[PDB]
Design a protein around this ligand. Structure first.
Ligand SMILES: Nc1ncnc2c1ncn2[C@@H]1O[C@H](COP(=O)(O)O)[C@@H](O)[C@H]1O
Length: 420
């Protein structure tokens, strides 16, 4: 219904699966003439031209963007946002979809986020930091247990009793790292319920919600092992009621966007809320200032609305209702053995040519050499599949995953298990 100039030159900043998903979606826009990804990866080269410039080499990206007359730049990773890529681009008159350094702090500093949510009455887990044991003790005795104790320098304890919490807190301050302000201990309210990711396009106070998704951050099946950037995800999320979703939109997302704007930090881009559906309603775990990975890989394929058109509409503050397919999407991450810890690179990946054309294969950390594929990163690939139902999406995804053979990769087999 909306009109925007065609034959656009578009630049996507990043190198992972999230960027491959963004590029893939952008390439299908009738408004795009030329698509570039910096620095991208071998898999992304199949849908866009790679630009050999680091995401943090801001001065070069600015020059490149002006040189190639880029009409729109989309930032994937948070690093360049935290570095002020948006600020520099805007000063050069370059259109870019992403938050300013000041607004991106919502993700950069968990303390800032907690500070903001407390001031504006946004539901979230209680949070407090201490350098004094006596002060930590008094606080712990007020909140009770179970409670979370976090030491700096492994260091996270979910204390089941107040006594254990005190022992852990004392240990954190005694054995924790000695910073320039001494040792410190972080205490947080332990929340229970179903976790879900709620992303939305934002521009000032205007919020445009995206479909919600559920990511499994634990490294191993049965949600065991250390936390990761995400080992799998799916959308929609049946177990999250529409009421929980709406409460999240009206009591969390809209208020956060208004809070940032009220604080002189208007946000533009994708505001990603990591939430917990508790019995008392939705509560924020953390905020991210851009597309989540692997959330983007399973949510963007469900978006029927043209992505580029949507982004431009948001940037112009125009009205827009996003449309989504009824079909579900589930994705599974293939990671290098050892990840999220130390992992090896260089294992050959066979079978990428055996996967169905309907399967969505997003490259993270792959490398092409001598006509073959090799692992080259923590998270290497993500394979997603569409399905009439979540169960169908899950079956198709895992069915296709078996076609891949690599002794240097592993992947959870329980993605979507509980949901179904
Ligand atoms: N206050 C909390 N209550 C329950 N779980 C939490 C809390 N904070 C963090 N987590 C878990 O830790 C994971 C990663 O958050 P983080 O360790 O801060 O990077 C989340 O996906 C949650 O499952």
């Amino acid at each position: 219904n909306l009109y925007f100039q065609s034959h656009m030159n578009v630049l996507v900043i990043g190198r992972g699966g999230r960027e491959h998903a963004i590029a893939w979606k952008a390439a299908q826009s009738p408004l795009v003439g030329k698509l570039y990804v910096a620095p991208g990866n071998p898999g992304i080269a199949d849908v866009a031209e790679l630009v050999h410039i680091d995401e943090l080499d801001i001065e070069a990206l600015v020059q490149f963007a002006k040189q190639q007359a880029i009409d729109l730049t989309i930032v994937g990773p948070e690093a360049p946002l935290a570095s002020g890529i948006v600020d520099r681009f805007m000063a050069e008159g370059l259109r870019i979809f992403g938050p300013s350094q000041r607004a991106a702090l919502i993700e950069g500093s968990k303390a800032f986020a907690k500070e903001l949510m407390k001031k504006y009455g946004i539901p979230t887990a209680d949070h407090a930091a201490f350098t004094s044991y006596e002060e930590a003790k008094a606080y712990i005795e007020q909140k009770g247990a179970p409670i979370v104790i976090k030491a700096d320098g492994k260091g996270v304890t979910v204390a089941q009793t107040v006594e254990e919490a005190l022992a852990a807190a004392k240990a954190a301050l005694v054995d924790g790292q000695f910073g320039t302000a001494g040792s410190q201990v972080v205490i947080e309210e332990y929340l229970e319920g179903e976790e879900f990711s709620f992303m939305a396009f934002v521009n000032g106070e205007k919020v445009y919600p995206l479909a919600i998704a559920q990511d499994h951050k634990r490294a191993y099946d049965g949600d065991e092992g250390p936390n990761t950037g995400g080992m799998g995800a799916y959308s929609p999320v049946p177990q999250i009621s529409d009421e929980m979703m709406d409460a999240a939109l009206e009591a969390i997302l809209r208020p956060a966007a208004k809070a940032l704007a009220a604080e002189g930090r208007p946000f533009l881009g994708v505001l990603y809320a990591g939430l917990m559906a508790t019995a008392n309603g939705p509560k924020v775990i953390e905020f991210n200032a851009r597309f989540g990975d692997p959330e983007a890989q399973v949510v963007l394929p469900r978006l029927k609305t043209d992505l580029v058109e949507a982004v431009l509409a948001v940037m112009d503050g125009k009205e827009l209702e996003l449309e989504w397919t009824d079909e579900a999407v589930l994705g599974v991450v293939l990671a290098a053995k050892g990840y999220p810890g130390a992992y090896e690179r260089g294992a050959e990946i066979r079978g990428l040519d055996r996967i169905s054309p309907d399967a969505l294969l997003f490259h993270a950390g792959t490398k092409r050499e001598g006509g073959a594929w090799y692992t080259n990163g923590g998270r290497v690939l993500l394979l997603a599949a569409k399905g009439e139902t979540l169960a169908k999406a899950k079956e198709k995804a895992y069915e296709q995953l078996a076609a891949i053979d690599c002794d240097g990769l592993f992947y959870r087999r329980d993605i979507g298990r509980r949901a179904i």
